[PDB]
Amino acid sequence: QREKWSSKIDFVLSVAGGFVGLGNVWRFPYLCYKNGGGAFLIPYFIFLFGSGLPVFFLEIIIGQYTSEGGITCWEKICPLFSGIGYASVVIVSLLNVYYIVILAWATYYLFQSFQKELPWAHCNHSWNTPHCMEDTMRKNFTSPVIEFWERNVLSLSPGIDHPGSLKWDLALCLLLVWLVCFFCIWVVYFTATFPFAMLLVLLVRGLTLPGAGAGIKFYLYPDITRLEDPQVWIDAGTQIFFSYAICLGAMTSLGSYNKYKYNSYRDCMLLGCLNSGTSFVSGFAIFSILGFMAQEQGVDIADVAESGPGLAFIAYPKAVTMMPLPTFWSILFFIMLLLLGLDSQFVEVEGQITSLVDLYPSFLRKGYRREIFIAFVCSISYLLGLTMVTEGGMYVFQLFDYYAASGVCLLWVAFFECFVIAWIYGGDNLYDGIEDMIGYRPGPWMKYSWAVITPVLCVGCFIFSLVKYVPLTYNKTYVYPNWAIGLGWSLALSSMLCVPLVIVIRLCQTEGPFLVRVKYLLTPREPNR
Numbered sequence: 001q002r003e004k005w006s007s008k009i010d011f012v013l014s015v016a017g018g019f020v021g022l023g024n025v026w027r028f029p030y031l032c033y034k035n036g037g038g039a040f041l042i043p044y045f046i047f048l049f050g051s052g053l054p055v056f057f058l059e060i061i062i063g064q065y066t067s068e069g070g071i072t073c074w075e076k077i078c079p080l081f082s083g084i085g086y087a088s089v090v091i092v093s094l095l096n097v098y099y100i101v102i103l104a105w106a107t108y109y110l111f112q113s114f115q116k117e118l119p120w121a122h123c124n125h126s127w128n129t130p131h132c133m134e135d136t137m138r139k140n141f142t143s144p145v146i147e148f149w150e151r152n153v154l155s156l157s158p159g160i161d162h163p164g165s166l167k168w169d170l171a172l173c174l175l176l177v178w179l180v181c182f183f184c185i186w187v188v189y190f191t192a193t194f195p196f197a198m199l200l201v202l203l204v205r206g207l208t209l210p211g212a213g214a215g216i217k218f219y220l221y222p223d224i225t226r227l228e229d230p231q232v233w234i235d236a237g238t239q240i241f242f243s244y245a246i247c248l249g250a251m252t253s254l255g256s257y258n259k260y261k262y263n264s265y266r267d268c269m270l271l272g273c274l275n276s277g278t279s280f281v282s283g284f285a286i287f288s289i290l291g292f293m294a295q296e297q298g299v300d301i302a303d304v305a306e307s308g309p310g311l312a313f314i315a316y317p318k319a320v321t322m323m324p325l326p327t328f329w330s331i332l333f334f335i336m337l338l339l340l341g342l343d344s345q346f347v348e349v350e351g352q353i354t355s356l357v358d359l360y361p362s363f364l365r366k367g368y369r370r371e372i373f374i375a376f377v378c379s380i381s382y383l384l385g386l387t388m389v390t391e392g393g394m395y396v397f398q399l400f401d402y403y404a405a406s407g408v409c410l411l412w413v414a415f416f417e418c419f420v421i422a423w424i425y426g427g428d429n430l431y432d433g434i435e436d437m438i439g440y441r442p443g444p445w446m447k448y449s450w451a452v453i454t455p456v457l458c459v460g461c462f463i464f465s466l467v468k469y470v471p472l473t474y475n476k477t478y479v480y481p482n483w484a485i486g487l488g489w490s491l492a493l494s495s496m497l498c499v500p501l502v503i504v505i506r507l508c509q510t511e512g513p514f515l516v517r518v519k520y521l522l523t524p525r526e527p528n529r
């Protein structure tokens with residue numbers, strides 16, 4: 001009863017709104033700034049042209065061919081490695097806990113931009129320390145925008161071990177965003193066209209700012225020696241795997257609604273180009289604004305703002321005040337951020353819910369219990385994400401961002417998605433199905449990226465990150481305690497360990513000698529419906 005899309009344009013809009021969002025506008029610039037300015041692009045492009053697009057198209061084609069969600073598609077592909085799908089769900093679940101938290105911040109900012117003057121424009125407020133000095137007079141001191149971000153929006157604690165108290169105002173914004181998400185799940189043209197126009201306006205403002213040449217050179221000129229550190233490689237690879245919403249099961253679920261005779265190859269390539277171009281262009285605006293900040297504050301470009309998940313809330317609000325009538329542009333920018341995040345959250349939550357109901361179609365999608373299940377999932381996610389709303393919750397958010405739905409947890413899955421398809425299931429066998437679906441035999445790029453490039457990249461990044469291990473730090477100053485790093489590793493393992501547990505369970509349930517069990521569990525039941 002897999003209801004196909006009403007039209008191809010519906011699928012295109014759905015995926016386009018799904019995989020563009022806070023990854024392109026918020027996470028990519030923050031990861032690029034955290035690592036080297038230009039050294040982040042080389043691994044980014046290598047993963048994009050070697051693993052990102054191939055894995056994205058692989059997930060889309062698996063969904064379209066099996067006509068099944070994230071979890072149940074692997075049952076038709078390779079029953080033994082079904083746990084990958086489960087792992088994917090776990091990953092997306094963790095993402096749904098913290099991704100929406102970002103929107104809460106934006107929502108708070110959206111409520112702080114209805115004043116006569118922007119709170120972060122000038123110093124001398126109730127939340128401003130005596131060190132806080134106006135940036136124009138910065139000829140020690142802290143920028144008022146950073147002061148507003150840290151002491152008013154966050155009210156940051158000394159560490160993760162001091163959770164402080166629930167803010168009661170970021171919590172309200174998070175509740176509002178979750179209510180919006182639940183009532184949407186329970187115009188797309190405007191919601192997709194407006195963010196690009198606002199991003200173009202921001203790009204023009206950043207480019208015309210004085211001192212932006214230094215920021216652009218910082219963003220574009222790589223540092224070769226930085227590539228000797230595995231952290232930039234793994235960060236760029238996982239940013240590629242996160243910005244495309246792969247290893248989550250959302251892409252497989254979205255593609256499962258496609259018609260069997262549908263040329264997913266061309267659309268997928270065009271959409272991947274669109275997403276990569278959006279990220280690359282937004283980086284130009286962010287780093288030109290950062291270069292202007294460096295010029296006006298008399299400080300290095302690497303010390304202007306926060307290296308953590310706050311660059312988008314420090315650079316863009318700064319550039320807003322430069323535009324005439326800054327209240328209007330602040331409202332527009334935060335509405336754009338809300339739209340992008342809400343679209344991404346809608347797509348991811350819908351994918352998770354449809355995978356879960358595919359897992360138990362008798363009850364979870366009977367018709368009456370689907371709404372109850374969606375409400376329960378939303379409530380559980382809100383209660384879980386309340387741990388990042390507290391004063392010390394930024395450190396928990398950083399732990400979630402670095403370990404959950406990112407890092408080796410993706411590299412673990414992207415390998416097993418490819419190794420099963422490329423070597424166990426068969427590259428040529430899937431190419432025959434893709435020829436039957438899209439009508440023409442594709443080039444060897446997908447086959448030689450699944451077979452060699454992607455598993456090699458994943459295993460090399462994993463091994464080189466483990467060999468030269470650097471503990472996670474917040475804003476390159478805070479040293480997490482041992483238990484915090486252990487909690488982050490537990491978050492990663494919660495999804496990493498689904499693959500072998502399911503293999504063990506399958507080997508124990510199937511009867512007979514070991515060889516017969518393995519042979520029967522490696523046989524695809526039906527590749528196509």
Ligand SMILES: [Cl-]
Pocket residue numbers: 023024028239240243275276279
């Ligand atoms: Cl990206």
Ligand code: NA
Pocket residue numbers: 019020021023024242243244275
């Ligand atoms: Na993206």
